[PDB]
Amino acid sequence: GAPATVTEQGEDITSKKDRGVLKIVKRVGNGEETPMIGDKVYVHYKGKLSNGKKFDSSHDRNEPFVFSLGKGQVIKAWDIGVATMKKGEIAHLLIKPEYAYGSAGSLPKIPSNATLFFEIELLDFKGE
Numbered sequence: 698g699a700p701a702t703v704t705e706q707g708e709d710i711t712s713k714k715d716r717g718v719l720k721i722v723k724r725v726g727n728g729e730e731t732p733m734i735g736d737k738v739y740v741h742y743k744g745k746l747s748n749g750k751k752f753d754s755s756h757d758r759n760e761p762f763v764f765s766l767g768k769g770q771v772i773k774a775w776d777i778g779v780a781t782m783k784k785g786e787i788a789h790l791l792i793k794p795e796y797a798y799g800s801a802g803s804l805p806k807i808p809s810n811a812t813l814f815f816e817i818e819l820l821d822f823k824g825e
């Protein structure tokens with residue numbers, strides 16, 4: 698499936714080069730600009746545990762998910778990944794636990810040492 702493709706084709710976008718955040722661009726976006734720390738970011742996403750026991754979709758709320766980049770309002774993998782994205786871009790992220798919810802997890806929803814997958818569309822970003 699899409700997660701395996703990211704394991705095999707995904708770019709390692711971590712500073713440490715520890716394969717903790719792997720990325721495939723699925724649809725190229727527009728312009729050269731990628732968001733800066735502090736920017737207000739608008740996305741649609743679908744997310745799952747790599748074992749697919751818990752699926753989540755902004756589409757199920759029919760409304761963008763909105764967050765300020767780089768403030769740790771979201772897991773570290775999103776601060777890293779969405780920062781690399783162009784407006785209009787769709788990307789797949791595969792995320793080791795270190796960059797998601799870790800050894801502790803987020804029970805009962807997310808188990809210890811969980812690998813996460815997302816598809817993310819960057820709708821827009823704007824300055825603080």
Ligand SMILES: COc1cc2cc(c1OC)OCCCn1cc(nn1)CCCOC(=O)[C@@H]1CCCCN1C(=O)[C@H]2C1CCCCC1
Nearest residue numbers: 742744745746751752753762770771772775803806807813
């Ligand atoms: C650990 O708790 C949740 C995790 C996840 C989704 C959650 C969580 O319940 C709070 O609610 C879905 C309802 C909408 N929504 C998203 C958020 N808050 N409310 C951001 C919460 C923080 O989430 C994250 O940092 C990441 C990135 C942004 C999208 C959501 N993320 C998740 O980890 C998802 C999780 C749900 C299970 C499948 C894997 C993704």
